[PDB]
Amino acid sequence: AAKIAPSMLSSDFANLAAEADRMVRLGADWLHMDIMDGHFVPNLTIGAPVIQSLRKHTKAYLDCHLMVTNPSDYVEPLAKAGASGFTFHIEVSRDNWQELIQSIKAKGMRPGVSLRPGTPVEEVFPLVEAENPVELVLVMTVEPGFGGQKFMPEMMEKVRALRKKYPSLDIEVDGGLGPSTIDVAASAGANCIVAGSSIFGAAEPGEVISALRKSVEGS
Amino acid sequence: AAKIAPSMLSSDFANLAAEADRMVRLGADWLHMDIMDGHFVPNLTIGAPVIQSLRKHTKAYLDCHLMVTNPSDYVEPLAKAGASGFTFHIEVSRDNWQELIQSIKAKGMRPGVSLRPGTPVEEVFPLVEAENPVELVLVMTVEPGFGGQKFMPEMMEKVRALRKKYPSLDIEVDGGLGPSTIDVAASAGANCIVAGSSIFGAAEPGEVISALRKSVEGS
């Protein structure tokens, strides 16, 4: 099923609760929260304290993407904060992804795994096929760290490979998604769409959300 | 001169613009922004993207405290974001402190340096005495990372030492400051007061801010 998730990194961080309400009001399915620690990626955004404050104001699904070096140390804080989805990077969980997925699920959060552009898609197959698997795979379509970057079409091959092997798996894409890039992504098989500037910078955000949904549903 | 700086780490992160404005209306001189990267301290809070959005909603002095391992990489982003004060930790700015101070000042921000409880106060004397010196020294009165911890009276010896040598230097304290601990800190010589839970958790925050200011001015 299609899930449109505005990237709050592109919203007014100073009026988060209002922005969250506005997005839900405009049709958003989830709110994508980019958590960066300045180490895994060269940018620092928000952490669990922000998620906790936001949860007090909304019941919306908070899709948290951990671009941090030590995701295991965020499981407890984010679960307490009220995170709904917890997506970690495959590049920093090579020795403990099994326990990490289990620890996330134990806390009632939906486990997901993300991969940077340079990481071969085959690396996440074991995580999708595990006894306790990830329930979402996030294919980054730009090098993670900043919004406003150029969509990388070559990443659609990863989306396609995943959709072919796993027809019911939630496949998310993040990086340059918007009206001009949604069709190729929807055709490739992506059903969860993270978009920032294309939604918040639009004259009609609600129309953009609907257009993204329609493209996915059309595929 | 006394400066009262509420610690936004204790505020409603989902209504930052409103909280900042409320603090200013209640008499806050500066807004203390704790930037933690999960590495220098075991917590991740907010980064330049949050500061940038807040600046669009306030003209208040944003006193940013960098509890990160690589402060040099935040100078440009925070300057663009509108930070007013940029305080780095002496424990991670080694051999690069002279350049760091110059880079901060070169970008229109006020340079400051902070020291954890375990760090001898003598460590910062050269920075205060340099040709292009720090303009504020932040004596942590709790181990940095979280709000609500117990004030450490023993840290007042650092404050006193600094005040004795530098009569006009801004000396800031952060950690457990409130009505019950301000007199001993004001007597020691601290004039810039960072307080979180004692202000955001108070029935009369305006009265608390005034009391903190009165204590400092009384000294």
Q: What is the DSSP string of B159-202?
A: HHHHHHH-TTSEEEEESS-STTTHHHHHHHT--EEEESHHHHT-
B34 labelled catalytic? yes
Q: Is A164 exposed, middle or buried (0-12, 13-18, 19+ CB in 10 A)?
A: exposed
Helix (H) or strand (E) holding B49: helix B48-55
Would you tell me the crossing angle of helices A16-25 and A205-218 to the nearest 10 degrees? 50
Distance CA A175, CA A156 (A): 12
> What end-to-end distance do the CA atoms of chain A give, in Å?
11
Q: How many CB atoms lie within 10 A of CB A130?
A: 14
CB of A117 closer than 8 Å to CB of A155: yes
Distance CA A88, CA A68 (A): 8
Enter the DSSP assignment of B90.
T
Distance CA B173, CA B191 (A): 8
Nearest residue to B49 via CA among A58, A47, A25: A47
Distance CA B133, CA B112 (A): 8
Tokens at B53, concatenated = 């959005």
The structure's method of determination equals: X-ray
Nearest by CB to residue A68, choosing from B20, B38, B73, is B38
Helix (H) or strand (E) holding A138: strand A136-140
Backbone angles phi, psi at A103, to 5 degrees: -65, -35
Tokens at A110, concatenated = 């939906």
* B57-79 per-residue burial string, b: 16 or more CB within 10 A, e: under 16: bbebbbbbbbbbbbbbebbebbb
Distance CA B32, CA A54 (A): 20
| Four-residue CA torsion sign, B55, B61, B62, B64 | positive
Helix (H) or strand (E) holding A5: strand A3-6
Q: Which residues of B touch A (CB under 8 A)?
A: 9, 11-18, 20, 35-39, 42-50, 52-54, 56-57, 68-70, 73-74, 77
CB of B32 closer than 8 Å to CB of B6: yes
Probe site for chain A from B11, B13, B21, B65 (most A CB atoms < 10 A): B13
Resolution of the solved structure (Å): 1.9
Min CA distance, A148 vs chain B (Å)? 13
Dihedral in degrees, nearest 10, Cα atoms B125, B7, B13, A173:
10
Q: How many CB atoms lie within 10 A of CB B115?
A: 20
Alpha-helix runs per DSSP H in chain A: 16-25, 48-55, 75-81, 97-106, 125-129, 156-165, 182-188, 197-200, 205-218
Q: After which residues is chain A broken (C to N over 2.5 A)?
A: none
Known binding residue A197? Answer is: yes
Which positions in chain B touch A74 (Cβ < 8 Å)?
44
Contact: B15, A12; criterion CB under 8 Å: no
CB of B136 closer than 8 Å to CB of B114: no
Distance CA A5, CA A19 (A): 13
Matching CATH number, A1-219, of 3.40.50.300, 3.20.20.70, 3.30.450.40, 3.40.50.10320: 3.20.20.70
Distance CA A166, CA A171 (A): 9
Which positions in chain B touch A70 (Cβ < 8 Å)?
38
Q: What angle do CA A54, A58, A60 make, to 5 degrees?
A: 110
Tokens at A120, concatenated = 């071969």
CB of B33 closer than 8 Å to CB of B10: no
Min CA distance, B140 vs chain A (Å)? 21
Distance CA A22, CA A28 (A): 9
Distance CA A43, CA B68 (A): 12
Distance CA B138, CA B63 (A): 11
Strand residues in chain B grouped as ranges (E): 3-6, 30-36, 61-67, 85-89, 110-115, 136-140, 170-174, 192-195
Nearest residue to B140 via CA among B167, B121, B165: B121
